[PDB]
Ligand binder design. Structure first.
Ligand SMILES: CC[C@@H]1[C@@H]2[C@H](C(=O)N1Cc1ccc3c(c1)OCO3)[C@H](c1ccc(C(=N)N)cc1)N(C)C2(C)C
Lengths: 10, 251, 27
């Protein structure tokens, strides 16, 4: 259920 | 947090979320203690019996949050870990003695209305506030119930520090001077506890002398959540402060 | 330091809804 985080962070 | 309440915006601006990258989930709570250092419980990152040993690259810290699951655009900041430091005498075998760890961030986090460090106690802060019956505050995004759900936003509960013999008498685990326990006794009727997912988050107290928030404790352990006759146990921050300074002074 | 002083409470002299409970327990 966690909203996706900006790709950069990952 | 069990029998807690929704936090207010900016109520706990030092609250940190330890977030696993893949699979994307909440790892633990933590605390911002300066622009590049985060404080958490050792067991959040290292617990061999369950084969837990997270590396810097396995996670992120999320600061400024309120919502548990939302990416809080323009509010939250997400930082990468430069290096993890675990107390070398953390006793994961017996009782979680010295349940404490530091994480250094890759880049300083910018403070904001939502992001702000908590103070660490000195001897007199500790001597003045860490008294049975004095209440502290615990915050986190952990479970709302021992078994069954999860919160949509950050939860908060205030709980009184408990007399050492009562802490002692509530458990078979051997208690050390580097722990304290907090919570209401069955007689008091009021309820509340930390629970799964709250680990590593802060126990804070507001000094009546200088009106600042100090982090006295770290959510460490307990048996179930909000059970009658049981109490949450917290790492004694002031007692481990020589190590905290040591690490920050050195690195 | 400015540690421990929240921008949206202490710094603007606002109290959150339950900090008095804390104060009230400090004797
Ligand atoms: C990884 C440790 C886990 C941890 C920790 C918790 O309590 N553990 C069990 C424990 C306790 C004492 C010990 C020990 C293990 O090894 C030696 O002594 C934690 C926990 C923290 C607080 C509370 C509570 N206040 N009720 C409830 C739970 N849990 C949610 C886990 C993540 C499973």
């Amino acid at each position: 259920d966690f909203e996706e985080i900006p790709e950069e962070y990952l | 947090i069990v029998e807690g309440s929704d936090a207010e915006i900016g109520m706990s601006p030092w609250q940190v979320m330890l977030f696993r990258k893949s699979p994307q989930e909440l790892l633990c709570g933590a605390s911002l203690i300066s622009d590049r250092w985060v404080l958490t419980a050792a067991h959040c990152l290292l617990y061999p019996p369950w084969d837990k040993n997270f590396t810097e690259n396995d996670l992120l810290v999320r600061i400024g949050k309120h919502s548990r699951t939302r990416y809080e655009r323009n509010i939250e900041k997400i930082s990468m870990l430069e290096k993890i430091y675990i107390h070398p005498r953390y006793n994961w075998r017996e009782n979680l003695d010295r349940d404490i760890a530091l994480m250094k961030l890759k880049k300083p986090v910018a403070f904001s209305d939502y992001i702000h460090p908590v103070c660490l106690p000195d001897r007199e802060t500790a001597a003045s506030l860490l008294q049975a019956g004095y209440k502290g505050r615990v915050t986190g995004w952990g479970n709302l119930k021992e078994t069954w759900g999860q919160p949509s936003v950050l939860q908060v509960v205030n709980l009184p520090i408990v007399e050492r013999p009562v802490c002692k008498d509530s458990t078979r685990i051997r208690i050390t001077d580097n722990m304290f326990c907090a919570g209401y006794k069955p007689d008091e009727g009021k309820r509340g506890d930390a629970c799964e997912g709250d680990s590593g988050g802060p126990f804070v107290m507001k000094s009546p002398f200088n009106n600042r928030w100090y982090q006295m404790g770290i959510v460490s352990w307990g048996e179930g959540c909000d059970r009658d006759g049981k109490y949450g146990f917290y790492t004694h921050v002031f007692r481990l402060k020589k190590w905290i300074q040591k690490v920050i002074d050195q690195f | 330091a400015d540690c421990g002083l929240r921008p949206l409470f202490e710094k603007k002299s606002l109290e959150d809804k339950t900090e008095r409970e804390l104060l009230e327990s400090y004797i």
